[PDB]
C-alpha cells in the first residue's frame with residue numbers, strides 16, 4: 123500500500139531520469155509555477171523546488187498525500203510546495219494557470235491504468251499559453267519473441283495436469299497479457315514503433331489508436347509471443363535531454379514488459395518482414411492480428 | 423485471474439500433498455460421498471473420483487466453476503462429479519450429508535483471506551456423524567529472523583531519499599506484513615508452535631486466539647523481524663499420513679512465509695529464551711509483543 127510508492131522510488135531508472143531531467147534543466151523550473159499531477163510522496167515536487175520553482179502544487183487523490191504533507195514539512199519546503207488532496211478534475215487550485223506540468227503517470231504498456239487522462243485534463247485546464255508538460259514525448263513499441271519452453275509452460279501444460287485433461291483452460295489464459303521482464307536473448311525481431319505521443323498536442327481521443335506494423339525478423343525461430351514496451355523522453359527546451367526505455371534490452375524497471383501470448387506459435391526466418399496490426403481500445407484492450415489470427419488481450 | 427489457479431496447480435508441494443493423501447488412502451474415498459469446498463478447477467474432486475468416490479460435489483462461487491464443468495466433461499467424470507456454483511452457505515446440495523469434506527482453503531499465515539469459515543460451515547451443516555474433514559490438522563509457528571541489510575532496505579532507507587527526509591514513512595511500512603520467501607540462513611531461533619487446529623473439533627470462535635511463545639535463540643545476532651508459517655497434516659484414519667510445511671527450511675510454496683518487521687531491532691544471544699505474545703483478531707490483524715514493544719500488523 124505504501125510499499126508500492128516505495129517500489130517506485132526504488133526504481134532507479136524511473137526516479138533518477140526525472141531527477142536528472144529536473145536538476146540538469148533548472149531554467150525550466152527557475153521562478154516558475156509547477157503542477158505535480160499524482161504527486162505521491164511528493165518527490166518530484168521536491169526536485170522542482172530544489173531546482174528553483176517559485177511555487178509547486180502537488181495533487182493526489184490517495185491517502186499518500188498526508189505522508190507527502192509531513193514529508194514536505196520535514197524538508198522545510200512548505201513555503202514553496204502546497205499539497206492538495208483530490209482528483210485534478212475536482213480540486214480547487216490557488217492559481218488560474220501554471221507554467222509547467224510534471225507527472226509520473228505511465229501504466230503498463232504505457233496506457234493500462236495510466237493517469238494520462240488526468241495529465242491531459244490538467245494541460246487543457248491549467249497550463250499557461252506557452253507552458254510545458256513533461257515528460258513531453260512517449261513512444262510504444264512491439265517486438266517479436268521466441269520462447270517455446272515458456273509457451274509449453276503456459277499452454278501445452280494444460281493437456282495433462284496430474285493425469286487429467288484441462289485443454290479448455292488454454293483459451294482462458296491466452297487473453298491475459300502478462301507483465302514480466304523478458305530474457306533479451308528471446309527477442310527475434312528488431313522493435314517497431316506503433317505509437318508516438320507528444321503531450322503538448324495529444325488529446326484523450328488519440329489514446330485509442332490503430333497501427334500497421336512490420337517486425338524485421340533477426341533469427342530463424344518459432345515466434346511464440348509479441349512483447350510491448352514504451353520509451354519516455356524529456357525534450358522540449360532542454361539543454362540536457364533525458365530518455366529512458368522500458369524495453370527488454372534496457373535495465374529493468376517496475377513496468378517490466380507486457381507480453382501477448384500467441385495461441386498458435388508459427389515459424390519465421392531471419393530477414394523476413396513480419397506484418398501485423400494492433401489496435402488499443404478503451405482498463406484497455408489490445409487487439410492483435412498476426413499470421414492471419416486475431417486475438418484481443420486485456421490486463422486483469 | 424485464471425493464472426492464479428494455474429499458480430496453485432504448479433505449486434507441487436501443495437497439489438502433490440493432496441494427490442498423495444487421496445491416492446494413497448483410497449479407503450477414505452471408496453464408495454463415499456465427498457464435498458470439495460472451493461473446488462477451483464476441480465482437481466481435488468477428480469483425485470477423489472479416481473480414488474473411488476461414489477459421488478463428488480464440487481462447490482465454488484467463482485467463474486472458474488464453468489471451466490471445472492468443462493474439465494470434468496473432458497475427463498468423462500460427469501457421472502461421478504457434480505459442480506455447483508455459489509457459496510457453500512447459499513447453495514442447494516442434492517444430498518443431506520456427505521462422508522468426507524476436502525478443501526484447499528489456506529491463506530497466508532494460514533488465516534489471512536482463508537476459506538476456513540466456509541469449510542467449518544460445511545462441516546457443521548453437511549458432514550455425516552462419524553464423517554471426516556481433510557486436511558484435518560494444521561499448525562502455525564513463529565521463528566526469529568536476523569537480516570540487518572533488509573531492515574536497512576525497508577526502514578533506514580527512508581532517512582535520505584534522493585537527498586530528502588522521508589522518516590515519517592517508516593511508520594506506514596512497519597504495519598504491513600510482508601509475504602515472501604526467506605533465506606533460511608537468516609533464521610536465528612528454533613520455531614515455536616503458536617496454534618494447533620483440528621478441523622473436526624474447531625469452531626470459527628477458535629480462529630481468534632492468543633498465545634504466549636518462547637523462541638529458543640540459536641545465533642547471537644540482531645533480531646530484525648518475526649516470521650510466521652504453517653504446517654498441514656492429513657492424519658485421521660490414514661495408512662499413509664501426509665504432512666507439508668510452508669516454513670523457510672522447506673521447499674517454497676505459493677504461501678511463502680509471512681514477515682512481521684520490527685521497528686526497533688534488538689540484540690539476542692545464542693541459547694537465550696526470547697519470550698513474547700501474539701494475538702490474531704478478525705482481513706485479520708496480528709498483534710505482537712516482544713522486547714517490550716507491541717505492534718499490530720495487517721496484510722493489505
Ligand SMILES: O=C(NCC(=O)N1CCCC1)Nc1ccc2cnccc2c1
Pocket residue numbers: 124125126128129567568569570572573576600602604646647681683684
Ligand atoms: O520487506 C521485505 N520485502 C518486501 C519489500 O522489499 N518491499 C519493498 C517495496 C515494498 C515491499 N522483506 C524482508 C524480509 C526479511 C526481513 C528481515 N528483517 C527485516 C526486514 C525484512 C524484510
Ligand SMILES: O=C(NCC(=O)N1CCCC1)Nc1ccc2cnccc2c1
Pocket residue numbers: 267268269270272273276300302304346347381383384424425426428429
Ligand atoms: O507467461 C509468463 N509468465 C506468467 C506465468 O508464468 N504465469 C503462470 C501463472 C500465471 C502467470 N511469461 C511468458 C514470457 C514469455 C513468453 C514467450 N512466449 C510464450 C510464452 C511466454 C510466457
